[PDB]
Amino acid sequence: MSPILGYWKIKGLVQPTRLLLEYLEEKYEEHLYERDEGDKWRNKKFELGLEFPNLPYYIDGDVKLTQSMAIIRYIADKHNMLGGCPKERAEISMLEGAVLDIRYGVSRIAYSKDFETLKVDFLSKLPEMLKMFEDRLCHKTYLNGDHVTHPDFMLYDALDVVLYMDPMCLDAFPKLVCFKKRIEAIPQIDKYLKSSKYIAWPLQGWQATFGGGDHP
Amino acid sequence: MSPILGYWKIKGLVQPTRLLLEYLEEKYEEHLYERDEGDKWRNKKFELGLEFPNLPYYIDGDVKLTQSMAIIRYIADKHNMLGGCPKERAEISMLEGAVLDIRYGVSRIAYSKDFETLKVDFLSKLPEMLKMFEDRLCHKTYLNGDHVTHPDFMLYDALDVVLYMDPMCLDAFPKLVCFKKRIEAIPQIDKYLKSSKYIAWPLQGWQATFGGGDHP
Ligand SMILES: CCCCCCSC[C@H](NC(=O)CC[C@H]([NH3+])C(=O)O)C(=O)NCC(=O)O
Ligand SMILES: CCCCCCSC[C@H](NC(=O)CC[C@H]([NH3+])C(=O)O)C(=O)NCC(=O)O
């Protein structure tokens, strides 16, 4: 019984988790809820044995989890990727949070009718946020050094998303540009992005003003 | 050189961390930025050796951290409180996320001019969120069982906050009511809440429409 990953058929909160599973070459099945299957989800929500019913959820022979960050960290933890000591684990958790400020920064304004105006303010703040990652990568192949960790896939997802908002937001950040290409150069990832399992759109929920809809 | 915890002189994102430090009886100093000291923060922001400059930050003889969740988890990790195995650590991370949905649910609408209207929608969703914790606590003293973990202080903070929004939101949840009292019954916590170090207000930043200002 291979693990089941449930979520809307969008990138959203679970995309980084998918990339991690693919990177690790872990077998898994997905239960994807289409745009008109909310009803299907509601009728199963409290019937899966989940303590805190939500999307995404992860069910396998050992656990039943919800909360996207708990799920991605569980998968990484099962592969001894969370960090070898408190200091290292904290570094990795700090990177997570830093990436979320960007990813969630996008989603918080993506559902507004005044997206364009909010976008201006967000994009004026994005540079400073990106620069901390740029500096972090000037002497490191990946966020935690020579080896890939789950925050790398989180950052990748965030970069993919902001590049849709503004294709030139990385022009002043060559290391981030190269980092994104480097992630796509990982064999498992390249294979995944080219497979039928890859969900390129939407970024947020279908109803979103930005990153929504059925097509880019 | 005891650890330094920097943050605005508000509860906000760091309150649970303060409670954890007090619970563990760890010595620490705080660098509190008053409402009119933003300028003071800006001039120090990139001068503290922080890789991802932000508030709160935690600096001690071993690390320099930012991102509230990385900080609270570091402190807990130093005391072997994050979980003994992947499954347990994931349970604890799931609880964190579940609490944040509530705490951040409040902050996302607390800065709006239309707070009252947004409040109505939030409070109609809060019950379902609280009920998952209520059920979790029907056969457990604390969120993870007989012993306290950092999510307990996170939940406490969230309950403290929503009780300000609606003093009756816990009427249908007796276990959560008792849980809040149980936390306040911990000697270190009772002592802290009664000390001069305790910051009762504001909940969000001073500019917030809800939980803001200099006085309740
Ligand atoms: C960040 C970019 C895009 C975000 C799209 C929204 S995610 C779907 C939504 N789930 C959540 O909001 C989960 C939040 C939770 N904190 C987590 O991280 O898992 C849902 O439908 N949950 C099911 C339910 O509420 O019943
Ligand atoms: C949740 C209830 C109340 C929230 C009040 C806002 S927190 C202060 C703000 N910091 C952040 O937003 C940090 C976000 C980061 N994700 C974290 O969790 O630490 C700041 O002034 N950072 C300093 C800066 O940006 O220079």
Swiss-Prot record, chains A, B:
Residues 85-203 form the GST C-terminal domain. It is an enzyme of class 2 (transferase). GO terms for molecular function: glutathione transferase activity. Conjugation of reduced glutathione to a wide number of exogenous and endogenous hydrophobic electrophiles. GST isoenzymes appear to play a central role in the parasite detoxification system. Other functions are also suspected including a role in increasing the solubility of haematin in the parasite gut. Its EC number is 2.5.1.18. The keyword Metal-binding does not apply. Homodimer. This is Glutathione S-transferase class-mu 26 kDa isozyme. There are at least two isoenzymes of GST in S.japonicum. Keywords: Transferase. PANTHER family: GLUTATHIONE S-TRANSFERASE, GLUTATHIONE TRANSFERASE. Residues 2-83 form the GST N-terminal domain. Coiled coil: none annotated. It comes from Schistosoma japonicum. One of its GO terms (biological process) is glutathione metabolic process. SUPFAM superfamilies: GST C-terminal domain-like, Thioredoxin-like. InterPro entries: Glutathione-S-Trfase_C-like (IPR010987), Glutathione-S-Trfase_C_sf (IPR036282), Glutathione_S-Trfase (IPR040079), Glutathione_S-Trfase_N (IPR004045), GST_C (IPR004046), GST_superfamily (IPR050213), Thioredoxin-like_sf (IPR036249). Belongs to the GST superfamily. Mu family. It catalyses: RX + glutathione = an S-substituted glutathione + a halide anion + H(+). Substrate binds at Y111. The keyword Electron transport does not apply. It holds the Pfam family GST_N. The lineage of its organism: Eukaryota, Metazoa, Spiralia, Lophotrochozoa, Platyhelminthes. Glutathione binds at Y7, W8, W41, R42, N43, K44, K45, N54, L55, Q67, S68.
